[PDB]
């Protein structure tokens, strides 16, 4: 299995913007536990969401996971400058985790 | 006040076995898995595997079977990978990342990576 994701989104402050993650086998599924976790400069990463929907203690709320017709989905609603980074999702296939290629997200 | 704190940069040869750690605090080492993820420029992550510190168990990606292992030592709440046969496709920065699986899973706090170079004796 093989995990896409767009290469590059830009978005400006304030806006929403959705990130999105394909799995090639087929629909991504509740079964994939779909997560996101995001990259910083000087590898700086933190984990947003997982299990889909559900956010990690502490992120913010403003960062929202679902599933978007055959894909999970990534929402960032009224992104902030500081949200500017790589986003990775990941998905799981019944015994092991697929990593996307990454989505770098420019806010103007 | 969680901190996942990985050792510091390696150099070694080519054919040889390197052992990273990964030592936990600020929380129950037991109630979280141990992810350790491979990032190598222009290829994103890749998984590498998991393991269960609560009796150790591991799952790893097929591809890292006979590269990887995992292991936890409870005592002092540290996670290790070792890798073996080095080559210069494992020059990467490794990082471990825990997670919560129950009810749900999630990733949140990461190591702040350890740089591995795969480099020759001149």
């Known amino acids: 299995a093989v995990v896409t994701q767009e290469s590059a989104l830009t978005t400006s402050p304030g806006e929403t913007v959705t990130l999105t993650c394909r799995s090639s086998?087929?629909?991504?599924?509740?079964?994939?536990?779909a997560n996101w976790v995001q990259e910083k400069p000087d590898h700086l990463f933190t984990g947003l969401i997982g299990?889909?929907?559900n956010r990690a203690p502490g992120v913010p709320a403003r960062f929202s996971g679902s599933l978007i017709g055959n894909k999970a989905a990534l929402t960032i609603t009224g992104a902030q400058t500081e949200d500017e980074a790589i986003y990775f999702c990941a998905l799981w296939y019944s015994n092991h985790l697929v990593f996307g290629g990454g989505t770098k997200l420019t806010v103007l | 006040e969680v901190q996942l704190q990985q050792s510091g940069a390696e150099l070694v040869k080519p054919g040889a076995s390197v052992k990273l750690s990964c030592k936990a605090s600020?929380?129950?080492?037991?109630?979280?898995?141990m992810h350790w993820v491979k990032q190598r420029p222009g290829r994103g992550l890749e998984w590498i595997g998991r393991i269960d510190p609560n009796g150790g168990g591991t799952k790893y990606n097929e591809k890292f079977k006979s590269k990887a292992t995992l292991t936890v030592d409870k005592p002092s709440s540290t996670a290790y990978m070792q890798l073996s046969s080095l080559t210069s496709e494992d020059s990467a920065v490794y990082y471990c990342?825990?997670?919560?699986?129950?009810?749900?899973?999630?990733?949140?706090?990461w190591g702040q990576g350890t740089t591995l170079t795969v480099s020759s004796a001149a």
């Open positions: 600020g929380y129950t080492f037991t109630s979280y898995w």
């Open positions: 299990g889909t929907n």
């Open positions: 086998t087929g629909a991504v599924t509740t079964s994939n536990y």
């Open positions: 990342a825990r997670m919560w699986y129950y009810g749900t899973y999630y990733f949140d706090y």
